[PDB]
Structure formats: C-alpha cells, structure tokens
C-alpha cells in the first residue's frame, strides 16, 4: 500500500474548507519463473566420466547470468520480471544531459541534486565500469575533481555516498546503434523489492521418449528458478540519459 | 473517504475460510452391505 | 489503523506547507511572507558581477557587502544546487577547493554556519522566471516568526 | 489444473504488507534553526 | 484391487520435453454380475406411449 500527503492551505476567516482526503494506491509484484534442460544419451552418460558434476557448474553460470541481466534489465512485459532501468525509463526520473551527446562533471552534480532531499541521504550509486573510469579521467590539475590517483583501486566512496557495480547497462553512447542510453543512476534503493519463491532446484529425469511415445534412449536434467521484482516509488530514482542523433 | 480501493478501500484486510464447500450430490446405496462378495485371483470368476 | 495513518498524513501536510510558506510567502491575501519576498527589490539586493554569470567573486561580494555588525553573526542559505555550483567552481586546485569529490557536503563555508532551503530557487537557466534570487546571507535574528 | 482464479486458483492466500508507502517529497528548510521565535497574544505583535 | 493412487513426477509436452506438470493417477478393478435370476421380482409399471 502506497499513499501520500494531506494538502493545507492558507484560508481567511468564515471560509468552508476544502476536501483533502488523499489518495490510496497498491503496487503489487507478480512472480515469475525460469527454466533449463540439458538432454543427454545412454552411451555419452555411461563412457564420459564425470559429466553430472559439469554440468551442475554449468547450470549455477546460466542461472547466475540470467538473474544479474534480468534484474538490471527485464522487459517487464511476457514472461519476465521488471528491472530498475526498464522500470525507470521514460518516467520524471529521467534527465538530459547539460550539453548533448557528451558526458561531463556537472552531469553528476545534477543527477546527484535533482533528486528530493528526503531520498538523497540514503542513496547510492550505480553503473557499469567504463562510466567509472570517465569520472575518473576528469580531473587535470589535481582540483575539486581529483577522486583518486592513477595506481590505485576503485573508490569506496562518491559524494560521500555508496558506490556499485554493474555491467548489463549501457557503456557507450556512440558505438551503439541504440538512440538512447542510460549510463548512470543514483537513487534511494529501498524502494526496489525483490521476491524470492525458490531456489535453483535441479531434478533427474530417467527415461526421455520419442515420436511414438516409445523410449529412444536418453536422460535429462531439469532445472527452475521462481523470482520476482518492480519499482513500488518511481520518483526516487534519478536515472541519466544521454541520447543521441539517431 | 470510504470503502472504495481507491480511496482507502485497499487498506481492509481480506476474509476467506480456507474449507472447500462440496456441491455434489453424491449417491447412497446399500448394496455391498447385502450381496455376496468374494475376492478374485485373476481375470474371470467361475461357478 | 486508519487513525494513526492519517494523523501520520496531517503531520507531512502540515510540515510541507509551513517550510514553502515560509521559506517564498507571498505575504498579501491569506499568506505570510517569506523571506525572499521581504528581501525583494529593497536595499538588501545585488546584481552579479557579469550577467548572468555567478562566479566566486559574487560569493565574496554577498559575503563583503555586509556591515561589520551583521556578518560576525549570521548563516547562509541556498538550494543544494547552489552549494554544488560552488563546489565546481576550483579547477586547479587553488583556493577555490572548497571539498574534493568523494566526500559529502561541508558544514562551514567562510567560517560561518549554512543551511538547506529547498524551495528557494534553483535553476536560472531552465527556469522562465525573469529573476532568479539564489544566494542569501544575513543576521537571522531579524527575521521574526511570531506563532499563536 | 493451474494458477487461473477459476482452475484450482482460489486456494491460494492473499499475502499483504500492511505499512504504508509515502509517495510524497515533502520540504526540508532549516529557517526555523536561525530565525527568531516570539510567542503572540492576540491577532498583531508590535515593535 | 483397491482404490490405488500414483504420483508422477513429470509429464511431457509436444516436442517430448518437459512442460513442468505433475499428475495423479487413481485406478480400480472390479466386476459383478448375478448368479440365479429366479431369486428375484422386480416390478416395472408399464407406461403406453
């Protein structure tokens, strides 16, 4: 359940109020559910040794790049969960850059200031690395933009604020034949919820069939995964986007 | 303010008791209190 | 528990209007005045240095101007969006490092104490206002607010 | 025999978090850190 | 035999892959018939049409 706030107003004497009953309204998180399988026959199961444990390994990789992609970016629509970016984009929590098609220090500055102070004391940082590095080439002179010095790690710390990690978003607004790209977001975090079902289950299926509803041979393996997320407040996010000549 | 969801309508918890209500009739017979009843070993009974 | 929830809902209200009334009243009809009306078109405000330019020497301006009386007791008051203009104005490092990037927001600035004010203006270049009031600095003890 | 309201789906509970979500910006000024505070007997104070 | 009920783990779909469904599966074995039909008197009212 979500609300908002009664709304006052300045009034002079003998003058009938007005209604503020507030609004109610009620965002909800569907659940969803992933799936693999991985085939495989009677005289390749017996002669390859140690397969089964291959190829666990191999289902945990897929499974852990699935849910990283889908939760920085899920359509939302069909089958697939929201991600912050898809849910974020279009809404009030977009801006334009100061100067098109370019990426300077003030763009932080006002992606950092355009958001409500409510949210900005709890917010934090988030992007892919090749952004990291841009802010980090800004300074020349050692001034106000100095982060950290060449020879040194990733900073903890931006604005005095937390700082992430993530490769699925946007890198480079030129290389790319997309017209819009979303390379920096800052925001209040609590406000995106994920909804966990149940883990990675893995199940072994003895007998596959053909055609003829008659055995033909093989095994398989069957795994499934149940998750869900979406975006409860979107005006606490100030999500940056730098489009380009399309 | 009232009982509309939208306006505070969706605060209101939800009622439901979890039982299943049959709705079929169902059928009553006495037969197997009266007749003979033999245990078979296979495919036909002989007499 | 709908007592408690609007209770809650009135008190969010009631704080939202306060701190916009006061901080941009317009002071006739039904409203109180705000500072930044008060202080509109009368002695207390200056013109840049350039137009429509607001560089360092503006800062040392408003700060200077002021009677001796006045400025050894007083506070500031700006949007965020200012104090970051501010804290873009060093490059090389001189003078002008008020703070380096990574760290969070000063409590000092000339030695004297600064406040948030977030419905004073922000933008003079987005914006379609005319005027733009931005910066302030005062003796706050003249400054009255006089509650029933 | 699925998730479909009329297919069995009616069994499923009604999960809710009760807490509300404020949705509004509200307004930080520290004005009232600063200012000067009288308290008024009537309708005008004078000075 | 008795009222028996099996669970299966999976059933299969079109391409003979996995649509991810269970079942129940219930089964039963009886017959009847009469053995002298002239211990009886069953009574019909016969309707003309």
Known sequence: ?246 | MGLTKADGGYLVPFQLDPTVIITSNGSLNDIRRFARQVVATGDVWHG
Request: glycine share 8%; net charge negative.
């Open chain 1, 1 to 246: 359940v979500s609300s908002a706030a009664v709304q006052w107003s300045w009034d002079a004497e003998f003058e009938e109020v007005s209604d503020d009953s507030p609004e109610f309204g009620q965002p909800e998180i569907p659940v969803k559910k992933a799936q693999g399988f991985v085939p495989i026959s009677i005289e390749a199961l017996q002669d390859e040794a140690n397969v089964t444990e291959t190829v666990a390994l191999l289902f945990a990789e897929g499974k852990d790049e699935l849910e990283a992609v889908t939760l920085t970016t899920g359509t939302g629509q069909g089958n697939q969960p929201t991600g912050i970016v898809t849910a974020l984009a279009g809404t009030a929590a977009e801006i334009a850059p100061v100067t098109a098609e370019t990426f300077a220090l003030a763009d932080v500055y006002a992606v950092y200031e355009q958001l409500a102070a409510r949210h900005r004391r709890q917010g934090a940082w988030l992007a892919n690395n090749l952004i990291y590095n841009k802010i980090r080439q800004f300074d020349t002179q050692g001034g106000a933009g100095l982060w950290t010095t060449i020879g040194n790690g990733e900073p903890s710390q931006l604005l005095g604020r937390p700082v992430g990690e993530a490769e699925a978003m946007d890198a480079n607004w030129n290389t790319s034949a997309s017209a819009d790209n979303f390379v920096l977001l800052y925001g209040n975090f609590q406000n995106y919820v994920i909804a966990d079902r149940i883990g990675m289950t893995v199940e072994f299926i003895p007998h596959l069939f053909g055609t003829n509803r008659r055995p033909n041979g093989s095994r398989g393996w069957f795994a499934y995964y149940r998750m869900g997320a979406d975006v409860v407040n979107p005006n606490a996010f100030r999500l940056l986007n730098v489009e380009t000549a399309s």
